[PDB]
A paper describes a structure:
Attempts to solve the structure of full-length wild-type LigE (282 residues) and LigF (254 residues) were unsuccessful, but C-terminal truncation constructs of both proteins were generated, successfully crystallized, and used for structural analysis. LigEΔ255 and the LigEΔ255-GSH complex crystallized in the space group C2 with four molecules in the asymmetric unit with electron density for the bound GSH molecule. In the LigE dimer, helix α4 of one monomer is interdigitated between α4 and α7 of the other monomer, and the entire dimer interface is contained within the α-helical domain. The dimer is anchored by a hydrophobic lock-and-key motif in which Phe-101 of each monomer is in a hydrophobic pocket formed in the second monomer. This motif is seen in several GST classes, including Alpha, Mu, and Phi, which display the more typical four-helix bundle dimer mode rather than the elongated dimer of LigE. An extended loop between α5 and α6 in the C-terminal domain, which protrudes above the normal α3/α4 packing site, may be responsible for the alternate dimer formation in LigE. The C-terminal domains of both LigE and LigF are composed of six and eight α-helices, respectively. The loop between β1 and α1 is longer in LigE than in LigF and occupies the space between the thioredoxin domain and the α-helical domain, whereas in LigF, this loop is moved away from the domain interface toward the surface of the thioredoxin domain. Based on structural properties, LigE is most similar to the fungal GSTFuA class, suggesting that the enzymes in this class are present in both prokaryotes and fungi.
Following oxidation of the α-hydroxyl group in GGE by a Cα-dehydrogenase, stereospecific glutathione (GSH)-dependent cleavage of the β-ether linkage in β-(3′-methoxyphenoxy)-γ-hydroxypropiovanillone (MPHPV) is catalyzed by the glutathione S-transferase (GST) enzymes LigE and LigF, forming β-glutathionyl-γ-hydroxypropiovanillone (GS-HPV) and guaiacol. LigE catalyzes stereospecific cleavage of (βR)-MPHPV to (βS)-GS-HPV, whereas LigF catalyzes the cleavage of (βS)-MPHPV to (βR)-GS-HPV. Consistent with their classification as GST enzymes, LigE and LigF each adopt the canonical GST domain fold with an N-terminal thioredoxin domain (residues 1–82 and 1–76, respectively) and a C-terminal α-helical domain (residues 93–255 and 93–242, respectively) connected by a short linker (residues 83–92 and 77–92, respectively).
Numbering used by the authors:
A (entry chain B): 4 to 255
B (entry chain A): 3 to 252
The structure:
């Protein structure tokens, strides 16, 4: 007090990679708490916690253990209604999940393959083996990470245009939460926060309209998304035959 | 004014509402507990029917207040009647339902429009038929004639159910988009399927589609608002050997 312990999932740079952990960090700072960060990575999670969890994020509030990023957010609104609210109501929760699933299929799907080797190489030394064989086999390969990531220069141009439905929303609002951000923003942002933690070449063009919301989000809470290990999201260079990355239109 | 608001409808020959914008307005009004004074009429003569006030419907008249556009009407009701059940819970709902609505219009309305545009024409009021024909055959392209656009729908309709899975995924975990009770998010989404049911002379969904629970409860709301005599069934799509599996069965 005013502190809550958080079990992180970090890269070798100390930088968070897990989007679930990312939106939980933002949710905690939204509520105005200080975070006691427990470092670590993909391996040894059960041992790092008291045996209470095989997954992160996990928080400990005084001595109350809360598992699952979604549950954590609901817990914070329930126990601390006096601090800035994360959810507007039940309708937000349902429509959030629809947006989140779409971002995951549209952005995370393709980008995961484009950065799967960077993902591995940027991980903690103890993690790299576990990440290698399991990722190139479970999620899956069926073969190896150098072969899956190869050719990303050809895939990355194809993603920006597909994000237009999301651009369409942010064109007419400052935050998903309106004039101020909430968990809808943080959950959406987590997709791009993960991407920045592993993207050793930028997935978006320098003038993508998303940049306004993205930079503001990453700057929130004293630069929560500006950890020294983070990579630029912007700088994608396109070719004559590439698709236009976004709709260029003004503006009645 | 008792408890009454006037609504300029957009009806087919059966008296059934076709416009999804009008549909979600009917639900919004009933959600607020109002009685609806319906002004009938179809696609033609809207400027005549209104005071020269609108070329489009829905329009409502609340005592002397004329209100245009279904989204604005919903906001107007929440602003003027904060004592009656809320349509929006806040700004976040508004932003995220636009995202869902946009997706539903791209995924469901677009393909089903092409599949039912001739039925749409045939079911409209007699005085609207030629206008709907000429209008649609120049604007939304399709394009050819109504007959050509709708031709081959038996091969296209089986392709739509699989693409609705992202929407199923949400409804499999909640009673309503609004939670334990419906609100404008539900009514806006339902309006897509209400429109479809008004023009679909062959069913677009299988009898066992997991969407049916929400759809039937939705259509049944407010004394069967979605059960007007003219409505066609959404269910009964007959899949053939080659067709894709319509939904995830896990």
């Amino acid at each position: 007090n005013n502190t809550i312990t958080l079990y992180d999932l970090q890269l070798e740079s100390g930088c968070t990679i897990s989007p679930y952990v990312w939106r939980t960090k933002y949710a905690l700072k939204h509520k105005g708490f200080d975070i006691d960060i427990v470092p670590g990575g993909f391996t040894g999670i059960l041992e790092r916690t008291g045996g209470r969890s095989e997954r992160v994020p996990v928080i400990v509030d005084d001595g109350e253990w809360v598992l699952d990023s979604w549950v954590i957010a609901e817990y914070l609104d329930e126990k601390y209604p006096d601090r800035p609210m994360l959810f507007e109501g039940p309708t937000q929760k349902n429509l959030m999940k629809f947006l989140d699933n779409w971002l995951w299929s549209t952005a995370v799907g393709p980008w995961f393959r484009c950065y799967i080797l960077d993902y591995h190489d940027l991980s903690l030394p103890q993690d790299r083996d576990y990440v290698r064989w399991s990722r190139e086999q479970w999620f899956l390969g069926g073969q190896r990470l150098e072969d899956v990531q190869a050719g990303r220069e050809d895939r990355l141009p194809l993603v920006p245009p597909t994000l237009e439905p999301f651009r369409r929303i942010l064109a007419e609002t400052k935050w998903l939460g309106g004039d101020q951000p909430n968990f809808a923003d943080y959950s959406a942002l987590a997709v791009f926060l993960w991407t920045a933690s592993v993207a050793r070449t930028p997935p978006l063009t320098e003038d993508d309209p998303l940049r306004d919301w993205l930079d503001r989000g990453f700057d929130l809470f004293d630069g929560l998304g500006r950890h020294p290990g983070m990579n630029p999201l912007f700088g994608l260079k396109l070719r004559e035959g590439d698709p236009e990355p976004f709709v260029r239109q003004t503006g009645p």
